[PDB]
Design a protein around this ligand. Structure first.
Ligand SMILES: [Fe+3]
Ligand SMILES: [Fe+3]
Ligand SMILES: [Fe+3]
Ligand SMILES: [Fe+3]
Ligand SMILES: [Fe+3]
Ligand SMILES: [Fe+3]
Ligand SMILES: [Fe+3]
Ligand SMILES: [Fe+3]
Ligand SMILES: [Fe+3]
Ligand SMILES: [Fe+3]
Ligand SMILES: [Fe+3]
Ligand SMILES: [Fe+3]
Lengths: 173, 173, 173, 173, 172, 173
């Protein structure tokens, strides 16, 4: 039955890592959709699209990390469908940064939930993995999205076309 | 109603490009699974694993290109679920490669069919884009895999571990 | 009497390439007019002027390729008056991008009509040249200019002058 | 209603500058036609062809300079049709060079006529522009074309093929 | 049938084979021209070197077809490379005029294969031919017609001084 | 009549050099066929394929040297059909290396016969040429090939797949 390498690894932590994986993939795809929206000719915000495209890659990397992690602890990667995103169309920069804030908070909650599971099962290696690789990155992302949303409001979104334009030239590279 | 940018881009073609988009993502996902499989402690063929990982990256780039294309032509990217792979475990390098051959031939047939679609709808721009960016790349990837399967059979797979071993040290980086 | 080099080049095609060459010069001249317009002291949008100046040179260079292509296949360049552009005056950046877009689609449709002539005449060399040198650049320019228009409208044009100053500093090289 | 920048610029000179610009474009167009003639497979004199291709770029830049000059002085650029050149077919390197001689002398007279007008209308800036930017380059080009014609006659043109061939290898770069 | 073959008509396979032989033929003919211009009593060394370069260029076209055949999963089958038409090529003009003719014949062969590939709805083959042969062919025909015009201008066949000059100036 | 350059070149030697030339071309063609066979997807031994490829280039260099030699001595290159190789299919690395040895020996026997002919016609020059440029290269080629075949046999050809695989990675590199 069990991997020659498995040690102190609970079944449930294994399953949780598979859930978290798929969730990282769901996040990726969502962002990949924003990139396509912001590259549309009637949207035309190139730096905002590039920003979501980057995040989309950040997220896909986060997933791989879980695959690697699973194999290392001797658990077995089991894949589920990656569900299409909530919307096909994202309104504008602020609607999108707002979706992004929730998507990040959702995923951060799953993380913190998995950390709690790991503490309950006394798997310090999983706790620390999450602490070093994920937890601090979500708190930077959320803080950076928060800052954007604030600035986007400052710029008079949703209504102020010129403020949306400025944001794209000045807050992303 | 129609995009300011659309010219000579038939509704049908637009829809096929979204189908094609879903296929590249589907394939990238399959290769991802194959990568995680070979990385398992009880498979442990690092170089085969890395081969499939680089391929799931190649297929993800293929996907992004259709996204970029759709918007260039003034179509709208509409996303579906990404289906999980046919399998959760891939047997061994031979079995994995036969499945890779299959997947590349399926994807190829879909590209041939879109080429046909686009010919009938008299779309030279889309025809060329298929020729330059997909068609040739596909025959290359398919010949490579055929070569590998032959070499894999030469090395006495499935039965022959020393064979599978040598393959991973020699036929891939 | 028949070029020694001529092979598989139908005379309607030769005729059409000459026609296409003239439209190429026309688009070039139009962009030249816009260049002169944005350099007026009462217009004074210099980045906009330069962009059209570069376009003026891109088209002149498309014209040049046709003369070569004509001689390469053994056809014979016949030139025709280059007609002055539609307007002596172009309103503002938005008005001009909008004309440009119209012109790029006219030139595009003319390229597509020629690609049809060549397909009917079973001339794959000319089909290929068109696809490789012209067809893709056209969709890139149409996408691009659409993208600009979107941004122009976002920025409050034709009414918003600040909106206009900014486009000229940021959207355009 | 008069541009804020205009000072000492007679309207006659404004018209005359528009007429001049159009001559430079005419000259340009003629040189293109010589370029394409010498590139024909039944003419095949590559260096002579390139020589004319360069002169047609130099005349294009002469037109650009007049556009700039109009705006600088506060005048308004008004464009006409650029007329097809006088021939479709240029004989041989001699006849072409004789035609270029007549073309440069024509454009020269036009410049002197504009100088006289400018002297009459007491516009010393327009004079000086003419003297620094056009007048001396016109005498050089004419001297240069002079010389070439004298050499084609020496080399036995129109009848001596071998003459024509050497000129292409030696007299032009 | 090959584990790699997909959408590749038997007929095309055969034509690709027919075509390879043509490339080799052309190559062999240029090689013969090199020998000719290298003769002591012809001795136009640059014109020789130009034909020797061409027969390499051709032998590379032959190779590319072999590689294509295998990529599509077809099977290379070779035939006798038939010897060139002439053992002696008169002079630079005759030679260049034969080379034009040959270039046109190989080009037609290529056009016929593109047509066949179009009829069998094989875009990969079309694009290969478009990308790798048709455009190199029009360049070659042009360059060659350019040489012929210049040779006639130089008074060939009669004028030796002309032939001499051509070998010094027109070819690298 | 006789070439201005001919001296001590017996006419039978001139014929044999022509005969020799065809042999070299012929060998070239056989090695080409071996190239294509090893590049087959169901054969797929790329390094063995590249070896035969290089070898057919080498043999064409040989044939050219004979054209050069022929003209140096004043004889006249006469060309024959290059017969197609003896098989369309080479079975495997061992069979092909065996065919290579026979072919290299047939060519060597021919070069010997020619040396013997030139010794009898008292043509030291032709003797030196066959010695400097061919005879020693033949014994190297033959030693390399017999080495190979010994190793193919050692590695268990034709039966052993892993043997053939290894040979391709280490004996040709
Ligand atoms: Fe994440
Ligand atoms: Fe995240
Ligand atoms: Fe793909
Ligand atoms: Fe693929
Ligand atoms: Fe254009
Ligand atoms: Fe354009
Ligand atoms: Fe001028
Ligand atoms: Fe001039
Ligand atoms: Fe060829
Ligand atoms: Fe050729
Ligand atoms: Fe040899
Ligand atoms: Fe040999």
């Amino acid at each position: 039955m069990v991997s020659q390498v498995r040690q102190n690894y609970h079944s449930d932590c294994e399953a949780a890592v598979n859930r978290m994986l798929n969730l990282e993939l769901y996040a990726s795809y969502t962002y990949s959709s924003m990139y396509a929206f912001f590259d549309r000719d009637d949207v035309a915000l190139h730096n905002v699209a590039e920003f979501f495209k980057e995040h989309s890659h950040e997220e896909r990397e986060h997933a791989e990390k879980f695959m690697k992690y699973q194999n290392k602890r001797g658990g077995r990667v089991v894949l589920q469908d990656i569900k299409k995103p909530e919307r096909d169309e994202w309104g504008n920069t602020l609607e999108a940064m707002q979706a992004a804030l929730q998507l990040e908070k959702t995923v951060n909650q799953a993380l913190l939930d998995l950390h709690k599971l790991a503490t309950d099962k006394v798997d310090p290696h999983l706790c620390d993995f999450l602490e070093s690789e994920y937890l601090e990155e979500q708190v930077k992302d959320i803080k950076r999205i928060g800052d954007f949303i604030t600035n986007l409001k400052r710029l008079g979104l949703p209504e102020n076309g010129m403020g949306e334009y400025l944001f794209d030239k000045h807050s992303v590279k």
